[PDB]
């Protein structure tokens, strides 16, 4: 929500690997500031439904060779890339489904990498604080409605809606 990828080229979204701090950071001027430029922009929010403060989300993620610096755990070898992969997650929903192996034991079993830590999952879902159309999946079905493979972030995951 421009403060992302929609920005003009100068200041560009950037991270400080030490903290929890977030900010552009100038390339001219070298310096540093507390996200958003505001060089042109002030509102543009909202949308037209229930509005759901929060509902916490969980997401399985699949990665694979197209993102930066591939690197699981149980596997540190990902070439399927985004062509054979759904091939996993697509007959993945039919276990899931019938809650025979649920999502709880098949987290701590895969999960994916980071997210796979905490049992498979990451938390509360709050004005998404992530993939602006990745966030918009846990606010868009019902709590427990998980949808299949979705296009975005860096390939093919899932999210659910977990209350």
């Keep these: 929500m421009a403060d992302e990828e929609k920005l003009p080229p100068g200041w560009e979204k950037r991270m400080s690997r030490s903290s929890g701090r977030v900010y552009?950071?100038?390339?001219?001027?070298?310096?540093?500031?507390?996200?958003?430029?505001?060089?042109?922009?002030?509102?543009?929010?909202?949308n037209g439904q229930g509005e759901p403060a929060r509902v916490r989300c969980?997401?399985?993620?699949?990665?694979?060779?197209?993102?930066?610096?591939?690197?699981?755990?149980?596997?540190?070898?990902?070439?399927?890339?985004?062509?054979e992969a759904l091939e996993l997650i697509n007959g993945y929903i039919q276990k899931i489904k019938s809650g025979e192996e649920?999502?709880?034991?098949?987290?701590?079993?895969?999960?994916?990498?980071?997210?796979?830590?905490?049992?498979?999952?990451?938390?509360?879902?709050?004005?998404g604080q992530m993939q602006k159309p990745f966030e918009d999946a846990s606010f868009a079905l019902r709590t427990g409605e998980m949808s299949g493979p979705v296009f975005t972030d860096s390939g093919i995951h899932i999210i659910l809606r977990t209350e």
């Design 24 to 46: 552009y950071f100038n390339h001219i001027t070298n310096a540093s500031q507390w996200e958003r430029p505001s060089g042109n922009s002030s509102s543009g929010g909202k």
């Design 58 to 83: 969980s997401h399985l993620l699949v990665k694979h060779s197209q993102s930066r610096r591939p690197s699981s755990w149980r596997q540190e070898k990902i070439t399927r890339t985004k062509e």
């Design 102 to 127: 649920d999502f709880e034991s098949l987290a701590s079993q895969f999960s994916d990498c980071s997210s796979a830590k905490a049992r498979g999952d990451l938390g509360a879902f709050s004005r």
